[PDB]
Write an enzyme that holds these catalytic residues in place. Structure first.
Site, PDB file in Angstrom:
ATOM      1  N   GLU A  37      16.459  -4.261  87.106  1.00  0.00           N
ATOM      2  CA  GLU A  37      17.798  -4.623  87.552  1.00  0.00           C
ATOM      3  C   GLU A  37      17.711  -5.563  88.748  1.00  0.00           C
ATOM      4  O   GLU A  37      18.064  -5.201  89.871  1.00  0.00           O
ATOM      5  CB  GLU A  37      18.598  -3.368  87.922  1.00  0.00           C
ATOM      6  CG  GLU A  37      19.085  -2.563  86.722  1.00  0.00           C
ATOM      7  CD  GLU A  37      20.131  -3.304  85.903  1.00  0.00           C
ATOM      8  OE1 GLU A  37      21.210  -3.612  86.453  1.00  0.00           O
ATOM      9  OE2 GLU A  37      19.878  -3.577  84.712  1.00  0.00           O
TER      10      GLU A  37
ATOM     11  N   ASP B 280      24.502 -19.531  99.263  1.00  0.00           N
ATOM     12  CA  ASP B 280      25.670 -18.947  99.919  1.00  0.00           C
ATOM     13  C   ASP B 280      25.265 -17.592 100.491  1.00  0.00           C
ATOM     14  O   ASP B 280      25.268 -16.590  99.775  1.00  0.00           O
ATOM     15  CB  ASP B 280      26.808 -18.741  98.908  1.00  0.00           C
ATOM     16  CG  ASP B 280      28.097 -18.200  99.550  1.00  0.00           C
ATOM     17  OD1 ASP B 280      28.040 -17.551 100.615  1.00  0.00           O
ATOM     18  OD2 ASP B 280      29.177 -18.414  98.967  1.00  0.00           O
TER      19      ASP B 280
END
Length: 713
Positions: A539, A571
């Site tokens: 994950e 970002d």
């Protein structure tokens, strides 16, 4: 130019708060454990916690002995102080209540704007400061079920449209736990279930576990009413922090972080520098504790020269050059200004004709419609260094008709342009749908809304749009076509500046992990690419694969990165995995990688509306521009943890004035976007916009993307 003193939203904390003894331990949750023992978490991995009290835990654990505050890394020192402040009654709960004594919740329609404070601790050099930042939550006073008129085929529509920011608060719970609705992976389909058993069970669950009393039961039924079996269950998960919980639209209300996102609301959440200052001083006066200073700290900042405002220029067909910052006999005509590009994609050289479409929202008054087409007609003329379509743009049927009419005129054509005049009322979704569908037809579009048309008219000719607006409309269109219509009087000390965005999505023979946008040292965008990645094992996205594909993809696009110096930005904070991935691409391709954290979401505010930058706690805060029209307080970009990566090795560096200058310049590349709100360096900003368009089903025209066409923006 010069320096200046500005008040910021920090207040010095008294050193007497520092704890005499800290206790280290190694092993509800570990975070809650540490918290209940007036302590924090040191190593989330090795479950290592530091407490200021005698650890009470009916479970296994080995005391790693005592430790002193001086031995904790800064981060933990500040975290431990934050926890200690809470023990003296100084926490978000208490201070948010104090704030609402002066700035009260206000309701607009079915929504209530709730002011509160976000708090954190920053260590400047040897001192600790409490950051008190005013924020707002927007909460529906109507349940999700009531909002959609108990219609299953309206509820799902709601979930899909507000997907990106919607959160749901279980008001039927004493904990008012907040959730995020789950969605059909790689899609906008919300995970719903019409099984009446699920609904009955979880509805009954609230009563049994929380209001198991005749009186509480009565109130519950008075507030929510009997179970509505026609409502589907919403599969969701906790917003905080793998579990997945079922929610009943009948028992939950939509909630939003205002700062993360109407008109009247927007206003109320925007606070002028002096208002925030005063509200904070009010809270401080109401705080009956000496553990923190009574006044806000001031700090010396560096102003930014007006000269750095004129480095970007444009020219006409004569020989005049003027920097982006805006009698003659010819000033009577509606002719748009003339802009002579420095570079024009070689693609336009061959292209035969370019069909021109004027799309008019039938909802607009006739006179507005005529104004727009006349504005568009002049815009296209200057565009050169016609089909008019009128439909109900605020209806799905109107939009479908537009697309069909345009597709009919675009068959066998390589490129088209659409100029759209629409009412301000159209949802963001409808605007996006219109643009995306036209692009599937090779039609780039430019939207001008009714507000601009009515309020930006030239003072000397009301049948003409403002000169400022006209220039920017022209800049916007030109950038959508990859035209280098400006020149930057500056050179970045890098081969390429690259912005990336990581956001997994799946597309027809694709499965894309994100995007990347490249600018050259001259300040021109050159390449925009998707980053294809295989199926993820654990994950977590494999950044080694990600960056490797980034390099290979750019090569496919005619740009080899290996053996070059690049500034790579994203970002937010550079993760450990992203650093590894960057060390990987650095050694493998001999790429000298410079990177740093570019944070737009932080609580620090300077109460002045001017361009500046300053060092606080080891990070540099930069305000790229002042608010020229809109209300509010400037949001600084936070720069930190800069580092250089050579031959796979990382060397923590220090941010310099030159670095701040680079970020500054990168922030000024907004391509005509009226109302400069771009809080991020252009490379990062556009990477995010592209990742968004890919996730929104936009066609990926590599031909256009290879020339820097910002068609999805």
């Amino acid at each position: 130019s010069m320096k200046a003193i500005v008040v910021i939203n920090l207040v010095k904390i008294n050193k007497k708060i520092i704890p005499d003894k800290i206790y280290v331990y190694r092993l509800y949750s570990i975070y809650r454990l540490a918290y209940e023992n007036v302590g924090i978490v040191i190593d989330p991995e090795n479950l290592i916690i530091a407490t200021t009290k005698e650890l009470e835990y009916e479970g296994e654990f080995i005391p790693e002995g005592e430790i002193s505050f001086s031995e904790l890394r800064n981060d933990y020192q500040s975290k431990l102080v934050l926890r200690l402040l809470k023990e003296n009654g100084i926490g978000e709960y208490e201070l948010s209540k104090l704030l609402r004594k002066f700035r009260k919740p206000k309701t607009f329609g079915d929504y209530k704007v709730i002011p509160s404070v976000e708090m954190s601790v920053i260590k400047h050099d040897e001192d600790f400061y409490l950051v008190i930042h005013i924020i707002h939550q927007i909460q529906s006073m109507k349940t999700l079920w009531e909002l959609v008129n108990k219609d299953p085929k309206e509820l799902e529509e709601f979930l899909m449209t507000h997907k990106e920011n919607l959160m749901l608060k279980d008001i039927a719970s004493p904990l008012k736990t907040v959730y995020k609705p789950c969605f059909e992976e790689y899609t906008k389909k919300p995970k719903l279930d019409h099984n009446q058993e699920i609904v009955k069970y979880w509805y009954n669950y609230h009563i049994e576990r929380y209001w198991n009393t005749p009186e509480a039961k009565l109130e519950f039924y008075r507030k929510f009413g009997q179970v509505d079996l026609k409502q589907p269950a919403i599969l969701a998960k906790f917003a905080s922090k793998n579990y997945k919980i079922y929610l009943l639209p009948q028992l939950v209300v939509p909630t939003y972080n205002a700062e993360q996102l109407a008109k009247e609301i927007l206003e109320y959440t925007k606070l002028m520098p002096e208002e925030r200052k005063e509200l904070l001083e009010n809270i401080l006066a109401e705080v009956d504790s000496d553990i923190i200073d009574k006044s806000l700290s001031e700090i010396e900042v560096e102003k930014i020269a007006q000269e750095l405002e004129n480095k970007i220029r444009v020219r006409d067909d004569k020989g005049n050059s003027v920097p982006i910052s805006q009698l003659l006999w010819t000033n009577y005509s509606r002719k748009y200004p003339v802009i002579l590009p420095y570079e024009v994609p070689e693609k336009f050289r061959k292209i035969r004709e370019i069909p021109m479409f004027i799309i008019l929202d039938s909802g607009l008054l006739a006179d507005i419609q005529n104004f727009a087409t006349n504005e568009f007609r002049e815009l296209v003329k200057s565009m050169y260094y016609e089909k008019v379509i009128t439909e109900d743009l605020n209806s799905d049927k109107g939009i479908i008709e537009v697309v069909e009419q345009v597709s009919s005129f675009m068959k066998g054509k390589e490129l088209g342009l659409a100029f759209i005049a629409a009412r301000n009322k159209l949802s963001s979704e409808k605007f996006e749908e219109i643009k995306r569908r036209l692009f599937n037809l090779n039609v780039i579009s430019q939207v001008v809304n009714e507000d601009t048309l009515k309020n930006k008219r030239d003072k000397y000719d009301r049948n003409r749009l403002d000169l400022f607006v006209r220039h920017n409309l022209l800049f916007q269109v030109l950038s959508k076509l990859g035209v280098k219509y400006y020149v930057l009087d500056y050179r970045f000390n890098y081969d390429y500046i690259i912005g990336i965005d990581v956001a997994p999505m799946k597309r027809s023979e694709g499965y894309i992990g994100g995007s990347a946008v490249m600018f050259d040292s001259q300040g021109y965008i050159r390449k925009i690419v998707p980053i294809k990645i295989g199926e993820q094992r654990g994950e977590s996205v494999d950044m080694n694969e990600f960056f490797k594909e980034m390099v290979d993809k750019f090569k496919e696009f005619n740009i080899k990165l290996d053996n070059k110096k690049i500034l790579l930005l994203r970002d937010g904070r550079i993760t450990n995995n992203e650093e590894e991935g960057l060390k990987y691409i650095s050694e493998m391709f001999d790429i000298e990688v410079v990177t740093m954290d570019v944070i737009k979401n932080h609580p620090v505010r300077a109460f002045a509306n001017m361009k500046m930058y300053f060092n606080l706690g080891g990070a540099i805060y930069l305000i790229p521009h002042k608010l020229k029209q809109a209300k509010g307080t400037p949001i600084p970009i936070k720069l930190a943890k800069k580092r250089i990566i050579k031959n796979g090795k990382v060397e923590k560096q220090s941010i310099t004035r030159q670095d701040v200058l680079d970020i500054f310049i990168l922030t000024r590349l907004n391509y005509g976007s009226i109302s400069a709100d771009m809080r991020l360096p252009a490379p990062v900003h556009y990477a995010h916009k592209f990742a968004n368009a890919i996730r929104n089903e936009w066609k990926i025209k590599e031909e256009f993307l290879a020339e820097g066409f910002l068609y999805f923006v």
